[PDB]
A paper describes a structure:
Five GEPs (1, 2, 3, 7 and 8) bind T117 with nearly identical behavior, including GEP 1 and GEP 7, which differ only by alternate J segment utilization, showing that the two incorporated mutations did not affect binding, so no further IGHJ1*01 GEPs were produced for study. The surface is colored to show hydrophobic patches, defined by the program HotPatch; patches are colored in descending order of total area (red, orange, yellow, …). The total surface area for red and orange hydrophobic patches is shown. The crystal structure of GEP 7 is partially disordered in HCDR1 and 3 and so patch area is underrepresented in the calculation.
An effective HIV vaccine will likely need to elicit broadly-neutralizing antibodies (bnAbs) that target the viral envelope protein (Env) as part of a protective immune response. GEPs showed detectable, but extremely weak, binding to soluble Env gp140s and extremely limited neutralization potency, though some reverse engineered epitope-scaffolds (ESs) showed robust GEP affinities, well above the B cell activation threshold. Reverse engineered ESs are ideal reagents for studying the binding properties of GEPs. Multi-log improvements in affinity for ESs were the result of improved off-rates or combined improvements in on- and off-rates, with a small number of enhanced contacts to antigen observed in the crystal structures.
Author numbering:
A (entry chain L): 0 to 27, 27A, 28 to 110
B (entry chain H): 2 to 25, 28 to 52, 52A, 53 to 82, 82A, 82B, 82C, 83 to 99, ...
The structure:
């Protein structure tokens, strides 16, 4: 039975400099914390940020971190930079078939 | 490590499409196919370790996806049949990362991605 991953929120509206916390909930415990996070910008391929729940991929800056085990995982961007507005996906690869969350769009807050 | 895919295709409903991905080691690492529709996120279709020559599929696509590989050309292929409007998507080939050459341990997550291939079903 495939593991379903559900992200929240669907959209996160924030200002540059703010902390972004994104959640990924699995329907079943994720084997060995084999959980990754990706960033994707429009018309570009995804980029790996985090693997093994908490390990940063090569070249990924210190402001990205991942945490969690079992069924609840979190990607945090400690202080959002303008280049960080994008869509973020989680993925489990502990069990067949590999499955992805539906994506959380991190976007700039509308003008007051 | 670069993955370069074939160009966009527009297909008739009920036809089949075959997309390629050229890698630039090839035989020893898992290559997967992942798709993405307009505005379902990313969706995993299957994967192949070319050295073993056989594929593993998501049950969702079993019976109509074929994943193959060619060692001499360093090319992976995904063929999807009986196309429906819901199959309109960008199809990506992805390869797992390694910590390394052969000093690297594979890490499962997709470090390398092709540029994607848009398949539109009329």
């Amino acid at each position: 039975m495939e593991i379903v991953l559900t992200q929240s929120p669907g959209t996160l509206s924030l200002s540059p400099g703010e902390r972004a916390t994104l959640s990924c909930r699995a329907s079943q415990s994720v084997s060995s914390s084999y959980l990754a996070w990706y960033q994707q910008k429009p018309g570009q391929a995804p980029r790996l940020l985090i693997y093994g729940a908490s390990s940063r991929a090569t070249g990924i800056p210190d402001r990205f971190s991942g945490s969690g085990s079992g069924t609840d995982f979190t990607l945090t961007i400690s202080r959002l930079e303008p280049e960080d507005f994008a869509v973020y996906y989680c993925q489990q690869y502990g069990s067949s078939p590999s499955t992805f969350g539906q994506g959380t769009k991190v976007e700039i807050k509308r003008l007051v | 490590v670069q993955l370069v895919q074939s160009g966009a295709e527009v297909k008739k409903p009920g036809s089949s499409v075959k997309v390629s991905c050229k890698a630039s080691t090839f035989s020893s690492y898992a290559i997967s196919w992942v798709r993405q529709a307009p505005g379902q996120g990313l969706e995993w279709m299957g994967g192949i370790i070319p050295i073993f020559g056989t594929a593993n599929y998501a049950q969702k696509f079993q019976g109509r996806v074929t994943i193959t590989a060619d060692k001499s050309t360093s090319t992976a292929y995904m063929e999807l049949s009986s196309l429906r409007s819901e199959d309109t998507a960008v199809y990506y080939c992805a390869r797992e990362g390694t910590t390394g050459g052969w000093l690297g341990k594979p890490i499962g997550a997709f470090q390398h991605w092709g540029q994607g291939t848009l398949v539109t079903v009329s």
